């Protein structure tokens with residue numbers, strides 16, 4: 842519970858023909874530090890045909906429970922290819938300004954779950970409305986088999 846949860850806005854840019862995932866805020870960095878707080882930090886990777894193509898990262902303020910910053914992840918590709926991609930959100934933590942892992946992770950795109958795919962090929966399939974949606978993120982144990990050619 843509360844191990845993975847991010848509210849990202851799925852939208853497309855029909856003016857230039859490119860993706861633009863606007864991550865508003867997240868709610869998964871629960872207080873794991875004894876009498877303290879966690880240090881949220883995430884990055885995004887897209888697996889084109891099961892192969893890591895483009896790699897990007899975001900900036901989040903440490904010592905918080907809700908990773909908020911509002912950043913946009915752009916990826917230029919045809920509107921017909923946006924429905925056959927696979928983007929995976931990689932969440933991490935900097936335990937006491939050091940190093941930590943085993944946080945939430947999720948894959949969104951072509952062969953994703955209904956909750957994600959039904960909004961993916963819905964809002965960023967053609968419109969440009971920044972509709973943020975939340976979803977439970979699973980540990981990196983599941984992502985290990987997803988980044989290894991899942992399509």
Ligand SMILES: O=P(O)(O)O[C@H]1[C@H](OP(=O)(O)O)[C@@H](OP(=O)(O)O)[C@H](OP(=O)(O)O)[C@@H](OP(=O)(O)O)[C@H]1OP(=O)(O)O
Nearest residue numbers: 880881882898899900901902903904935936937938939940
């Ligand atoms: O939690 P953040 O606000 O995203 O900041 C972290 C943090 O830097 P700070 O010590 O200034 O808080 C990391 O430091 P460590 O917890 O690992 O000691 C640092 O990692 P490095 O020191 O290895 O650079 C990382 O930088 P990076 O994302 O390049 O790994 C950086 O994130 P930001 O650079 O986005 O602020």
